[PDB]
CSV table of C-alpha atoms (C1' of nucleotides) in Angstrom, one decimal:
chain,number,residue,atom,x,y,z
A,1,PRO,CA,36.5,-12.5,-37.3
A,2,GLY,CA,35.4,-9.7,-35.5
A,3,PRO,CA,32.9,-8.5,-32.4
A,4,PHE,CA,29.3,-9.9,-32.8
A,5,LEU,CA,26.1,-9.5,-30.9
A,6,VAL,CA,23.2,-12.3,-31.0
A,7,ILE,CA,20.3,-12.1,-28.7
A,8,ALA,CA,18.1,-14.9,-27.4
A,9,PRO,CA,15.3,-15.4,-25.0
A,10,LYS,CA,16.4,-17.2,-21.7
A,11,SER,CA,15.2,-20.5,-22.2
A,12,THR,CA,17.3,-20.5,-25.8
A,13,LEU,CA,20.6,-19.3,-24.8
A,14,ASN,CA,21.8,-22.6,-24.1
A,15,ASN,CA,21.1,-23.7,-28.0
A,16,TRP,CA,22.7,-21.2,-29.9
A,17,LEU,CA,26.0,-21.7,-27.8
A,18,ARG,CA,25.6,-25.4,-27.9
A,19,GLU,CA,25.1,-25.4,-32.0
A,20,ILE,CA,28.0,-22.8,-32.4
A,21,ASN,CA,30.2,-25.0,-30.7
A,22,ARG,CA,29.1,-28.1,-32.6
A,23,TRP,CA,29.6,-27.0,-36.2
A,24,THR,CA,31.9,-24.2,-35.9
A,25,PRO,CA,34.3,-24.2,-32.7
A,26,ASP,CA,36.7,-21.6,-33.9
A,27,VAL,CA,34.3,-18.8,-32.8
A,28,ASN,CA,34.5,-17.2,-29.3
A,29,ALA,CA,31.1,-16.8,-27.7
A,30,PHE,CA,29.9,-16.5,-24.5
A,31,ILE,CA,26.5,-16.9,-22.5
A,32,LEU,CA,26.6,-13.5,-20.8
A,33,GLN,CA,24.4,-14.6,-17.8
A,34,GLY,CA,24.9,-14.2,-14.0
A,35,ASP,CA,24.5,-11.7,-11.2
A,36,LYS,CA,25.8,-8.2,-11.1
A,37,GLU,CA,29.3,-9.0,-10.0
A,38,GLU,CA,29.2,-12.3,-12.3
A,39,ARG,CA,28.4,-10.3,-15.3
A,40,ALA,CA,31.5,-7.9,-14.3
A,41,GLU,CA,34.4,-10.1,-14.2
A,42,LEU,CA,32.8,-10.9,-18.0
A,43,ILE,CA,32.9,-7.3,-18.6
A,44,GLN,CA,36.4,-5.9,-17.5
A,45,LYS,CA,38.3,-9.4,-18.4
A,46,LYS,CA,36.9,-10.5,-21.9
A,47,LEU,CA,34.5,-7.8,-22.9
A,48,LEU,CA,36.5,-5.0,-22.2
A,49,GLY,CA,39.5,-7.3,-23.5
A,50,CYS,CA,38.0,-7.9,-26.8
A,51,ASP,CA,38.8,-11.4,-26.5
A,52,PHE,CA,35.6,-12.9,-27.9
A,53,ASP,CA,33.9,-13.1,-31.4
A,54,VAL,CA,30.1,-13.4,-30.6
A,55,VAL,CA,28.2,-12.7,-27.5
A,56,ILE,CA,25.1,-14.6,-26.3
A,57,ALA,CA,23.0,-12.2,-23.9
A,58,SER,CA,19.1,-12.1,-23.3
A,59,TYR,CA,16.6,-9.5,-23.9
A,60,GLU,CA,17.0,-7.7,-20.4
A,61,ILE,CA,21.0,-8.3,-19.8
A,62,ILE,CA,21.9,-5.8,-23.1
A,63,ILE,CA,19.5,-3.3,-21.3
A,64,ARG,CA,21.3,-4.2,-18.1
A,65,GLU,CA,24.7,-4.1,-20.2
A,66,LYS,CA,23.8,-1.1,-22.5
A,67,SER,CA,26.4,1.1,-21.4
A,68,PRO,CA,29.4,-1.3,-21.5
A,69,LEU,CA,28.5,-2.4,-24.9
A,70,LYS,CA,27.8,1.0,-26.7
A,71,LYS,CA,31.7,1.3,-26.8
A,72,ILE,CA,32.4,-1.4,-28.7
A,73,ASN,CA,31.5,-1.3,-32.4
A,74,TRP,CA,29.6,-4.5,-33.8
A,75,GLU,CA,29.4,-6.3,-37.0
A,76,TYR,CA,25.8,-7.3,-36.7
A,77,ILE,CA,22.8,-7.1,-34.0
A,78,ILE,CA,21.6,-10.9,-34.6
A,79,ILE,CA,18.1,-11.0,-33.3
A,80,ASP,CA,16.4,-14.1,-32.7
A,81,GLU,CA,12.6,-14.3,-32.3
A,82,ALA,CA,12.3,-10.8,-32.9
A,83,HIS,CA,9.0,-9.9,-31.3
A,84,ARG,CA,9.9,-7.4,-28.7
A,85,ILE,CA,10.7,-5.0,-31.4
A,86,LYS,CA,7.3,-4.8,-32.5
A,87,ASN,CA,6.3,-1.8,-29.9
A,88,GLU,CA,8.4,1.1,-30.8
A,89,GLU,CA,8.3,2.2,-27.0
A,90,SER,CA,9.1,-1.6,-26.1
A,91,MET,CA,12.6,-0.2,-24.4
A,92,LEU,CA,14.4,-2.9,-26.0
A,93,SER,CA,13.8,-0.6,-29.2
A,94,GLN,CA,15.3,2.6,-28.0
A,95,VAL,CA,18.3,0.5,-26.8
A,96,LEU,CA,19.2,-0.8,-29.8
A,97,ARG,CA,18.9,2.3,-32.1
A,98,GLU,CA,21.7,3.6,-29.7
A,99,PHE,CA,24.4,0.9,-31.2
A,100,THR,CA,26.5,1.1,-33.9
A,101,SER,CA,27.2,-1.9,-36.0
A,102,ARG,CA,27.9,-2.3,-40.1
A,103,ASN,CA,24.9,-4.4,-40.6
A,104,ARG,CA,21.8,-5.4,-38.4
A,105,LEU,CA,20.4,-8.9,-38.9
A,106,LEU,CA,16.9,-9.2,-37.7
A,107,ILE,CA,15.7,-12.8,-37.4
A,108,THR,CA,12.2,-14.2,-36.4
A,109,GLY,CA,10.4,-17.6,-36.4
A,110,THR,CA,6.9,-15.8,-37.5
A,111,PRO,CA,6.3,-12.7,-39.3
A,112,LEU,CA,4.6,-10.0,-38.4
A,113,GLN,CA,1.8,-10.4,-36.2
A,114,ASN,CA,-1.1,-8.0,-36.5
A,115,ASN,CA,-0.8,-4.7,-38.5
A,116,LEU,CA,1.1,-2.8,-41.0
A,117,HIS,CA,2.0,-0.6,-38.1
A,118,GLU,CA,4.1,-3.4,-37.3
A,119,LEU,CA,5.5,-4.5,-40.1
A,120,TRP,CA,7.6,-1.4,-40.7
A,121,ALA,CA,8.3,-1.5,-36.8
A,122,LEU,CA,10.3,-4.3,-37.8
A,123,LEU,CA,11.4,-2.6,-41.2
A,124,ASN,CA,12.0,1.0,-39.6
A,125,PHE,CA,15.2,-0.4,-37.5
A,126,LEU,CA,16.3,-2.1,-40.6
A,127,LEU,CA,17.7,0.4,-42.4
A,128,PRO,CA,16.5,4.0,-40.4
A,129,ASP,CA,18.1,6.5,-42.6
A,130,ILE,CA,16.7,5.3,-45.7
A,131,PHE,CA,13.0,5.7,-44.1
A,132,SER,CA,13.0,7.8,-41.1
A,133,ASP,CA,9.5,8.1,-41.1
A,134,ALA,CA,6.4,6.6,-39.3
A,135,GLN,CA,3.1,7.6,-40.7
A,136,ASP,CA,4.6,8.3,-44.0
A,137,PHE,CA,5.2,4.6,-45.0
A,138,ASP,CA,1.7,4.2,-43.3
A,139,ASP,CA,-0.8,6.4,-45.3
A,140,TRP,CA,1.9,5.8,-48.8
A,141,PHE,CA,0.1,2.3,-48.6
A,142,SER,CA,-3.1,2.9,-46.5
A,143,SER,CA,-3.6,-0.4,-45.1
A,144,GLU,CA,-4.1,-3.0,-47.5
A,145,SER,CA,-6.5,-0.6,-49.3
A,146,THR,CA,-8.8,-0.7,-45.9
A,147,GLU,CA,-11.4,1.6,-47.9
A,148,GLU,CA,-11.3,0.3,-51.5
A,149,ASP,CA,-10.1,-3.1,-50.8
A,150,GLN,CA,-8.4,-3.3,-54.2
A,151,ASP,CA,-6.1,-5.6,-53.2
A,152,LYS,CA,-3.5,-5.1,-55.9
A,153,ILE,CA,-1.5,-2.0,-54.3
A,154,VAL,CA,-0.4,-4.9,-52.1
A,155,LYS,CA,1.6,-6.2,-55.2
A,156,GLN,CA,3.6,-2.6,-54.9
A,157,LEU,CA,4.0,-3.8,-50.8
A,158,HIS,CA,5.2,-7.4,-52.0
A,159,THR,CA,7.7,-6.2,-55.0
A,160,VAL,CA,9.6,-4.1,-52.7
A,161,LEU,CA,9.8,-6.5,-49.9
A,162,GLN,CA,10.4,-9.7,-52.2
A,163,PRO,CA,13.7,-8.7,-53.3
A,164,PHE,CA,14.4,-7.0,-49.9
A,165,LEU,CA,13.2,-10.2,-47.7
A,166,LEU,CA,12.9,-13.9,-47.8
A,167,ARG,CA,10.1,-16.2,-46.8
A,168,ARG,CA,10.7,-20.4,-47.1
A,169,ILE,CA,8.0,-22.6,-45.7
A,170,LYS,CA,8.6,-25.8,-44.2
A,171,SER,CA,5.8,-27.6,-46.3
A,172,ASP,CA,7.8,-26.6,-49.4
A,173,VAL,CA,11.1,-27.8,-49.0
A,174,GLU,CA,9.6,-30.4,-46.3
A,175,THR,CA,13.4,-31.5,-44.6
A,176,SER,CA,11.2,-34.0,-42.5
A,177,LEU,CA,8.6,-35.3,-45.1
B,1,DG,C1',55.7,-58.0,84.9
B,2,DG,C1',55.3,-53.7,83.1
B,3,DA,C1',53.8,-50.2,79.1
B,4,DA,C1',51.9,-48.9,75.2
B,5,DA,C1',47.9,-49.0,72.7
B,6,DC,C1',43.5,-49.3,71.7
B,7,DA,C1',38.6,-49.3,72.6
B,8,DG,C1',34.6,-47.9,74.8
B,9,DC,C1',32.4,-45.3,77.7
B,10,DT,C1',31.1,-40.9,79.7
B,11,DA,C1',30.1,-35.8,79.2
B,12,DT,C1',29.5,-31.4,77.5
B,13,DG,C1',28.5,-28.5,74.4
B,14,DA,C1',26.5,-27.0,70.3
B,15,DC,C1',22.6,-26.9,67.7
B,16,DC,C1',18.7,-27.8,66.1
B,17,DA,C1',13.9,-28.1,67.3
B,18,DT,C1',9.5,-26.2,69.7
B,19,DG,C1',7.0,-23.0,73.0
B,20,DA,C1',5.7,-18.1,74.2
B,21,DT,C1',5.6,-13.8,73.8
B,22,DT,C1',5.3,-9.9,71.6
B,23,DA,C1',3.9,-6.6,68.4
B,24,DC,C1',1.4,-4.9,64.7
B,25,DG,C1',-2.2,-5.0,61.9
B,26,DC,C1',-6.6,-5.4,61.0
B,27,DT,C1',-10.9,-5.7,61.6
B,28,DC,C1',-14.2,-5.5,63.5
B,29,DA,C1',-15.4,-2.0,67.2
B,30,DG,C1',-16.9,2.3,68.2
B,31,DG,C1',-16.7,7.1,67.7
B,32,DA,C1',-16.7,11.1,64.3
B,33,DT,C1',-18.2,12.6,60.4
B,34,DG,C1',-20.0,14.3,56.7
B,35,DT,C1',-24.2,13.4,53.2
B,36,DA,C1',-28.4,12.0,51.9
B,37,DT,C1',-33.0,12.3,52.9
B,38,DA,C1',-37.5,14.6,53.9
B,39,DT,C1',-40.3,17.9,54.8
B,40,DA,C1',-42.4,22.9,54.8
B,41,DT,C1',-42.2,27.0,52.9
B,42,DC,C1',-41.0,31.2,49.2
B,43,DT,C1',-40.0,32.9,44.8
B,44,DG,C1',-38.4,34.0,40.4
B,45,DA,C1',-38.3,32.1,35.9
B,46,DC,C1',-40.6,30.1,32.9
B,47,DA,C1',-44.6,28.7,30.5
B,48,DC,C1',-48.9,30.7,28.2
B,49,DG,C1',-52.7,34.5,26.3
B,50,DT,C1',-53.0,39.0,23.4
B,51,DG,C1',-52.4,42.0,19.8
B,52,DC,C1',-50.1,42.6,15.4
B,53,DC,C1',-47.8,42.5,11.3
B,54,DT,C1',-44.6,41.5,7.5
B,55,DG,C1',-42.5,37.5,5.9
B,56,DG,C1',-44.2,33.1,4.2
B,57,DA,C1',-46.7,31.1,0.6
B,58,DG,C1',-48.4,31.0,-3.5
B,59,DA,C1',-49.2,32.6,-8.3
B,60,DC,C1',-46.8,34.0,-12.8
B,61,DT,C1',-43.4,34.2,-16.5
B,62,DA,C1',-39.0,33.2,-18.7
B,63,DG,C1',-34.6,32.0,-20.0
B,64,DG,C1',-30.6,29.5,-19.7
B,65,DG,C1',-28.4,24.9,-15.9
B,66,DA,C1',-28.9,21.0,-16.2
B,67,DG,C1',-29.6,16.8,-18.3
B,68,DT,C1',-29.0,13.1,-22.2
B,69,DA,C1',-26.5,11.1,-26.8
B,70,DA,C1',-22.8,10.5,-28.9
B,71,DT,C1',-18.1,10.2,-29.5
B,72,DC,C1',-13.2,8.7,-28.5
B,73,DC,C1',-8.8,7.6,-26.5
B,74,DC,C1',-6.1,7.3,-23.3
B,75,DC,C1',-5.4,4.5,-19.0
B,76,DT,C1',-6.1,1.6,-15.7
B,77,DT,C1',-5.6,-3.0,-14.9
B,78,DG,C1',-3.3,-8.1,-14.2
B,79,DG,C1',-0.7,-11.7,-15.0
B,80,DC,C1',4.1,-12.8,-16.4
B,81,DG,C1',9.2,-12.9,-16.9
B,82,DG,C1',13.1,-12.1,-15.0
B,83,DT,C1',16.3,-9.6,-11.5
B,84,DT,C1',18.1,-8.5,-6.4
B,85,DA,C1',18.1,-6.2,-2.6
DNA sequence: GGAAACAGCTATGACCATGATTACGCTCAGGATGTATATATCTGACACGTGCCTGGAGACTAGGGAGTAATCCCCTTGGCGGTTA
């Protein structure tokens, strides 16, 4: 049981704290909310005191709290609704390539929205030392064969990501019928 | 019957109210003053003719400024979300 970092949109920080209490009450988590002073007593007392397991913050708070969070090495950076990361220049991306966690569990509700460029934008922060490349990934696959429309080289895209990534749909396993 | 005590009357002073007087201002007076006005007469400067000539106005060629098309890509724009001073 160690240091954990999870991120939720402002509207959703209640739910994750609510569900963690309902299901596994043994984990120390905070909703890191409040004012500049009201975030401080969280910083020095509990966050600096290493008196927690997970920390629930918002999109901007981590940017507001980048410096007091670097000094704590993490286990995962749990990223719900990972849509702000679609842009590499979205400032949240440059604040997350700076933290040092052993694993980096990105989470989403919907997959990539528009482009292959976007796909490895999610993918490049997953295993950065492996790719370390931006346009190399792109012209390697050449955008679903945008010129020849072979639509068979897409199988190579699928074959790497199938044992590297997991999709399930509601229609298959209803759970709601 | 005498003495004290109080009450009412009287007078006088004080204070307020009214009348007059005066002084000052101003607004009429009236004088002083300076300004407009008109006129008749100089006069110098502005306007106009004359002559002349050289810039202005065509007349002509030639070569690149300006003008357009096509292209693109970067940027401004706007609404929001969430903070905070």
